[PDB]
């Protein structure tokens, strides 16, 4: 009956209400505690909805549509759910008046079909007009970094951000290919960019003051087995009554270990990486030959080394092939952050990079890293997609403006339905002003003044509260986000309003 | 066990054991052709359990 | 009134089916005991996952299986019609008419209804199996399940049906159009516009062998071998054991001469493709790639059954006996990239007509893509009703049949004397649920389209045959429009096998409920 539909309305608002403070770069962050006893705090709607695991079927649809938004595009997972659930509240008073839910869903598909046509009209392709090659990506990075603690140091941060994108092929770009390692302590303006890959350097074992950190072209070799004398678990049980045999079995167990240990020297690789801890036995023999070895390396960093110098992982030290080795241009071990950090530099075949960040605390750098991810997506999609639209309230207010005039020519229930859909588009600029501390009552009325003067580009300024054009604010958004957001929000809403009854079986 | 010297002998070892069954199979197919084999509206059905 | 309370329990299920039938209907969420969300329009899934105790609802569930197994369409027609017959019968139960004579009234009205169904046939299909002729049958089947894909999926489904259906007539001995003859696959990415129709089963495994595709020669011989590829051994057991390192050289060199000798005779016979149902050794890939033989592995035994109905190949339990009677024929074998992954497909061109085809579906959302697969799978069994048992005739759909039967049955009610006239008149009133169901789901006013619909079927013709309108249906539009459309415009009609079989099931479903005046149970 109608009771199940009303119950699904509050379920969509409850999920939407949690994502309202997370809308926008200045928006608040949500606290989610997983059953794994790990604290996770993020403003990205994808990770938010994936960690909740809501049992409600209609609320799960808002979670499933966010994964589809993260797949095709990946940006706007928070706004697509807010826009989808907003139609649940607008259609709530229409259900009590006797209006069928199918007539309401039918009016949305006619409004979205007309809205997509207006997106292409507002999208203007511009590349070399009034813009250069270097200044194109630099002006886009300063927009996402504004109104942040890094705004003073943003001058040095843009140079490292643009070079990170240009270091990869412009045909295929991925945010996971750019590594970021947090270094506690130090000045923020002293951070540098690294062409290779770095790791945490968890090696706790003695034997220091050897294996110098100045290399020319060291060879990289992957290690699998354990080269230390005493094993982790098993051992060798030998029962002998001779005194001389007690010393022989000590070297006998070491002879089997020295077998694969000596074969590493036959390869002639100065760099040895392994996912297992390397004891003091291997690093002592490698000290005289100036061979470096590091254990306890994460598996995620080992995959980047293969894509860097073109290496490979072999089980034993016998069949290792000579072409599996690799080398960088320069290897330097930096002590920045009261800890030594290994890094690679000058790899022409490297498909990944690493950007080091410095700050006063780990919690401060964590906000700098996440604020950079929003700027990378803008720089990445600039070269990929040449069709961009004006964001920050610009496009959102115009899509609702045109639907008001087109509804005057349409007769029937669909007139007020499109007007309700046009009113439902006002929640996006609302939460942006509320999460930024600005008054949502005054800006909503003042923005509609110049918005009716014929200019469609008037946006909302995120720095100082005022109405104006985002074209001077350098706020750019790709056209694929605005098109897929209206389709994903409507498709997810049509599935929720189409459920008359919820059946749940226990077992 | 079945021990074959050549690949063609493997099929001959299985056919040799079936030949004991095929020896009785030849008498069944010959019974239909011996009496009214080509006469129309006549047939034979194996009801063997 | 325990018989009345049994109808009230069905009334809760009756309202469930009112949101099912029709393109404007509603979809229900089915939560499985394994924690999986299931959303589909077809109501047979809901009745399958929900165990029924009370007999009145259980008979309707067993009656649903009667319609679902024999036909791929009309599952909602039986549940809605049989549920309304008990609702209109409450007026006769109240007046004091016994349920025994109520059944006798439906039995007399059933024979009068089935007789009029033969006169409702307007057109008839010539079984030409043309691309445009198959669109008329498939179009109403796609409707009431998925909206917006009706025009898109019309050309995709009709292409695969004509490939697996041979052209023949006046032969009823050999059955045609098996259920398994049509397979449907789906993949993430792309859209429905990029979907294509394959004339054979698509294999998702990658071409591990060095031979990507065969040559352009006609009728490539394919072999299906169940036995794995290895040195010839005993069929019973015959496990190779290792003892000393001296025997290792004889085991490696022994497999090189035996496999090369057996595969040399296979390539000389013209077999360019070998299907291995089991694991393939390392030495087997070395000899097959030098002779130009494409290596194909199918570990799933379910896919090998439908392959035997295409090229006519037979699986061989042994290895090394290339029997020509067990060899198949394929026109073209290539490797195409579907959804970003390169896979080796199976197809043919202008020869050896195949009884198995596969439609590749592409969609943005995996959740809605699975529902499209179920809508097409349900559309396959709807084609089965087009066979010899009265599959050529057709009746007007979109609510046109239920309205015309009202004037036909009510005319015989007052003409037939006796007490049976009370049940005959109420039997035609129960048909009013079909036009009202489409009106409530489409948002149309029940006080406008429904009463004005009877005025279209009632006209004064100076003759003995009512005519000049066969086309009056029920308006399925979601936008306000004056009047209703015609049947000829959208070519939306109901099949004879769907309508005639649903009447006999609906009458027997409501008869069992009216026949039960009490229940008898025991302690478990």
Chain B residues touching C261 at Cβ < 8 A: 7
How far apart, in whole angstroms, are the C-alpha atoms of residue A417 and residue A422? 8
For A498, the closest chain C residue by CA position comes to C26
Q: Do residue C33 and residue A502 have CB atoms under 8 angstroms apart?
A: no
Are residue A238 and residue A354 in the same domain, yes or no?
yes
Same domain membership, residue A259 and residue A365:
yes
Gap between the Cα atoms of A83 and A424, Å rounded = 7
C37 at A interface, C-beta within 8 A: yes
Our CA dihedral for A396, A402, A405, A409, rounded to 10 degrees, sits at -120
Indicate if A167 and A275 belong to the same structural domain.
Answer: no
Q: For residue C316, what is the DSSP state?
A: B
CB A326 within 8 A of CB A219: yes
Resolution in A: 4.7
State how far the Cα of A483 lies from the Cα of A477, in Å rounded to an integer: 11
For C443, the closest of A57, A65, A103 (CB atoms) is A103
Contact B7 C234 (CB under 8 A): no
DSSP A198-258: --------S--S-S-S-BSSPEEEEE-S--SSS-SS---------HHHHHHHHHHHHHHHH
Domains of chain C (ranges plus CATH)? 1-124+393-524 (1.10.560.10), 125-199+352-392 (3.30.260.10), 200-351 (3.50.7.10)
Distances (CA, A) of A55 to A47, A49, C311, C496: 17, 12, 49, 44
Q: Is C396 in a helix, a strand, or coil?
A: strand
| φ, ψ dihedrals at A361, nearest 5° | -155, 165
Q: Count Cβ–Cβ pairs < 8 Å, chain B vs chain C.
A: 11
Q: Backbone phi, then psi, for B36, in 5-degree steps?
A: 45, 50
Give C229's DSSP letter: B
Residue B7 is nearest to which of C232, C234, C236, comparing CB atoms?
Answer: C232
Chains contacting chain C through 3 or more C-beta pairs under 8 A: A, B
Interface check for C479 against chain A (CB to CB < 8 A): the answer is yes
Q: Which residues pair with A32 in a beta bridge?
A: A40
Same domain, yes or no: A274 and A333: yes
Q: What is the number of helices (H) and of strands (E) in chain B?
A: 1, 0
Indicate whether A257 and A137 sit together in one domain.
no
Distances (CA, A) of A223 to A203, A252, A375, A468, C172: 15, 23, 38, 60, 71
Longest CA pairwise span in chain B (Å): 49
Helix axes C75-88, C496-515, angle to 10 degrees: 40
Inter-chain residue contact C262 with B7, CB threshold 8 Å = yes
Measured distance CA(C389)–CA(C500) in Å, rounded: 12
Q: Do A274 and A146 fall within a single domain?
A: no
Q: Which tokens hold the place of C434?
A: 């079909």
- The verdict on A372 and A230 lying in the same domain is yes
Q: Residue A218 belongs to what domain range?
A: 198-383
Antiparallel, parallel or unpaired: β C220-225 and C271-276? parallel
Nearest C-alpha in B relative to C318: B11
Pick the residue of C257, C321, C323 with the most B CBs within 10 A to test the interface with B by mutation.
Answer: C321
Lookup: tokens for C445: 């006013």
| Dihedral over Cα of C52, C54, C55, C56: its sign | negative
Q: Are residues A143 and A168 in the same domain?
A: yes
Element (DSSP H or E) covering residue A322: none
Nearest-by-CA chain A residue for C50: A505
Buried/exposed A216-236: b ≥16 CB within 10 Å, e otherwise: eebbbbbbeebbbeeeeeeee
Distance from CA of C365 to the nearest CA of A (A): 7
Domain CATH for A185: 3.30.260.10
Please say whether the beta carbons of C125 and C6 come within 8 A. no
Question: Do residues A345 and A209 share a domain?
Answer: yes
- CATH code of the domain containing A248: 3.50.7.10
DSSP state of A374: H
Residue C360: strand pairing partners: C185
Taking the C-alpha atoms of residue A397 and residue A111, their distance in angstroms, rounded to an integer, is: 14
A246 and A139 in one domain? no
User: Do residue A141 and residue A278 come from a single domain?
Assistant: no
Contact C188, C366 (CB under 8 A): yes
Q: Using beta carbons and an 8 Å cutoff, which residues of C are at the interface with B?
A: 232, 234, 236, 258, 261-262, 320-321
Are the Cβ atoms of C19 and A500 closer than 8 angstroms? yes
Cα dihedral C131→C136→C137→C138 (10° resolution): 70
Question: B-chain residues within 8 Å CB-CB of C258?
Answer: 7
C-alpha C275/C-alpha C315 separation (Å) is 9
Same-domain check for residues A238 and A371: yes
Experimental technique for the deposited model: cryo-EM
A98 interfacial to chain C (CB closer than 8 Å): no
Test mutation, C227, C234, C264, chain B, max B CBs within 10 A: C234
Q: Can you point out the beta strands (E) in C311-374?
A: 328-330, 335-338, 341-344, 357-363
* Alpha-carbon span A451 to B1, nearest angstrom: 94
C-beta atoms surrounding A260 within 10 Å: 17
Give the residues across from C379 on adjacent strands. none
C189 touches chain A (CB under 8 A): no
Cβ neighbours around A129 below 10 Å, total: 7
């Amino acid at each position: 009956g109608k009771g199940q539909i009303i119950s699904n309305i509050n379920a969509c608002v409850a999920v939407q209400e949690a994502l309202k403070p997370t809308l926008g770069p200045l928006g608040s962050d949500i606290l989610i505690v997983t059953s794994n006893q790990k604290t996770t705090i993020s403003n990205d709607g994808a990770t938010i909805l994936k960690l909740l695991d809501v049992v409600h079927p209609a609320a799960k649809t808002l979670v499933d549509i966010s994964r589809a938004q993260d797949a095709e595009v990946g940006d706007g997972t928070t706004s697509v759910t807010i826009l989808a659930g907003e139609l649940m509240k607008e259609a709530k008073p229409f259900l009590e008046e006797g209006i069928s839910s199918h007539l309401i869903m039918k009016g949305y598909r006619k409004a979205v079909s007309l809205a997509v046509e207006k997106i292409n009209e507002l999208a203007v392709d511009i590349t070399s007009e009034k813009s250069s090659g270097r200044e194109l990506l630099e002006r886009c990075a300063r927009t996402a970094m504004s109104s942040k603690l890094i705004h003073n140091n943003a001058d040095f941060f843009v140079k490292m951000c643009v070079d990170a994108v240009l270091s990869l092929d412009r045909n295929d770009l991925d945010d996971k290919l750019i590594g970021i390692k947090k270094i506690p302590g130090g000045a923020m303006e002293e951070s540098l960019f690294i062409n290779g890959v770095a790791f945490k350097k968890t090696f706790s074992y003695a034997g220091f003051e050897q294996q110098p950190k100045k290399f020319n072209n060291p060879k990289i070799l992957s290690l699998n087995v354990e080269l230390e004398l005493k094993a982790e678990k098993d051992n060798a049980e030998v029962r002998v009554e001779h005194v001389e045999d007690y010393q022989a079995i000590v070297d006998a167990e070491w002879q089997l270990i020295f077998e694969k240990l000596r074969q590493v020297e036959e390869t002639g690789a100065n760099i040895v990486l392994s996912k297992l801890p390397i004891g003091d036995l291997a690093t002592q023999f490698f000290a005289d030959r100036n061979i470096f070895c590091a254990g306890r390396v994460s598996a995620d960093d080992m995959n980047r080394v293969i894509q860097a110098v073109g290496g490979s992982i072999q089980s034993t030290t016998s069949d290792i092939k000579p072409e599996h080795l690799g080398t960088c241009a320069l290897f330097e071990e930096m002590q920045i952050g009261s800890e030594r950090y290994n890094l690679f530099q000058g790899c022409p075949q490297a498909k990944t990079c690493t950007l080091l960040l410095r700050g006063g605390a780990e919690q401060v750098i964590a906000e700098v890293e996440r604020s950079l991810h929003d700027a990378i997506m803008i720089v990445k999609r600039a070269l990929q997609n040449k069709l961009i639209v004006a964001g920050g309230g610009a496009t959102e207010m115009e899509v609702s403006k045109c639907l008001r005039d087109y509804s005057k020519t349409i007769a029937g229930k669909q007139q007020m339905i499109i007007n309700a859909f046009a009113k439902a588009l006002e929640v996006i600029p609302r939460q942006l002003c509320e999460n930024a501390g600005f008054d949502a009552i005054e800006i909503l009325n003042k923005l509609r003044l110049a918005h009716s003067k014929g200019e469609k580009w008037y946006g909302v300024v995120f720095e100082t509260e005022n109405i104006g054009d985002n074209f001077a604010k350098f706020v750019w958004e790709p056209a694929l986000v605005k098109i897929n957001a209206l389709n994903s929000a409507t498709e997810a809403t049509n599935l929720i309003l189409s459920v008359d009854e919820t059946i749940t079986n226990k077992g | 066990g079945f021990f074959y010297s050549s690949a063609d002998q493997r099929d001959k070892l299985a056919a040799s054991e079936r030949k004991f069954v095929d020896a009785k199979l030849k008498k069944i197919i010959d019974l239909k052709n011996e009496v009214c084999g080509m006469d129309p509206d006549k047939g034979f059905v194996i009801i063997n359990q | 009134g325990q018989i009345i309370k049994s109808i009230a329990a069905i009334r809760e299920l009756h309202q469930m089916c009112l949101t099912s039938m029709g393109p404007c209907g509603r979809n229900k969420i089915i939560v499985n005991h394994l924690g999986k969300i299931i959303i589909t329009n077809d109501a047979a899934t809901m009745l399958r996952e929900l165990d029924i105790v009370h007999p009145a609802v259980k008979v309707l569930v067993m009656a649903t299986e009667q319609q679902k197994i024999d036909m791929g369409d009309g599952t909602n027609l039986v549940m809605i019609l049989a549920g309304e017959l008990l609702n209109v019968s409450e007026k006769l139960i109240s007046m004091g008419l016994s349920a025994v004579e109520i059944i006798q009234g439906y039995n007399m009205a059933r024979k009068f209804t089935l007789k009029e169904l033969d006169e409702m046939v307007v057109g008839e299909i010539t079984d030409k199996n043309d691309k445009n002729e198959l669109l008329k049958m498939i179009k109403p089947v796609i409707s009431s399940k998925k909206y917006g894909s009706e025009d898109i999926l019309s050309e995709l489904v009709s292409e695969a049906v004509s490939h697996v259906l041979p052209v023949a007539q006046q032969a009823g001995e050999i059955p045609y159009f098996n259920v398994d003859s049509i397979r449907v696959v789906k993949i993430m990415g792309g859209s429905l516009s990029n979907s294509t129709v394959i004339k054979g089963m698509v294999f998702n495994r990658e071409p591990e062998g060095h031979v990507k595709s065969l040559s352009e020669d006609k009728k490539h011989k394919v072999a299906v071998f169940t036995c794995p590829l290895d040195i010839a051994n005993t069929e019973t057991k015959g496990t190779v054991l290792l003892h000393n390192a001296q025997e290792m050289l004889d085991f490696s060199k022994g497999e090189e001469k035996q496999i090369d000798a057996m595969m040399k005779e296979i390539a000389d016979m013209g077999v360019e493709c070998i299907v291995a149902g089991a694991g393939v050794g390392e030495l087997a890939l070395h000899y097959l790639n030098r002779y130009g033989i494409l290596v194909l592995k199918v570990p799933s035994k379910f896919e090998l059954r439908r392959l035997c109905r295409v090229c006519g190949a037979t699986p061989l339990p042994r290895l090394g006996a290339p029997t020509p009677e067990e060899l198949g024929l394929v026109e073209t074998v290539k490797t195409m990239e579907i959804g970003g992954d390169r896979v080796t497909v199976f197809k043919q061109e202008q020869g050896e007509i195949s009884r198995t085809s596969t439609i590749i579906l592409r969609g943005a959302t995996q959740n809605n893509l699975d529902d499209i697969e179920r809508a097409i799978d349900d559309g396959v069994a709807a084609v089965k009703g087009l066979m010899k048992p009265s599959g050529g005739k057709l009746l007007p759909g979109a609510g046109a049949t239920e309205i015309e039967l009202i004037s036909r049955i009510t005319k015989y009610g007052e003409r037939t004397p006796g007490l049976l006239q009370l049940a005959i008149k109420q039997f035609a009133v129960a048909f009013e649920v079909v036009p009202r169901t489409l009106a409530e789901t489409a948002g149309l006013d029940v006080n406008e389209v429904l009463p004005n619909l009877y005025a279209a079927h009632n006209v004064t013709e100076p003759g003995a045959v009512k005519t000049d309108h066969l086309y009056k249906g029920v308006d399925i539009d979601g936008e306000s429009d004056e009047g209703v459309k015609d049947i000829r415009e959208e070519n939306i009609y109901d099949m004879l096998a769907t309508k005639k079989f649903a009447i006999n099931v609906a009458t027997e479903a409501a008869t069992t409920v009216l026949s039960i005046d009490q229940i008898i149970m025991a302690k478990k």
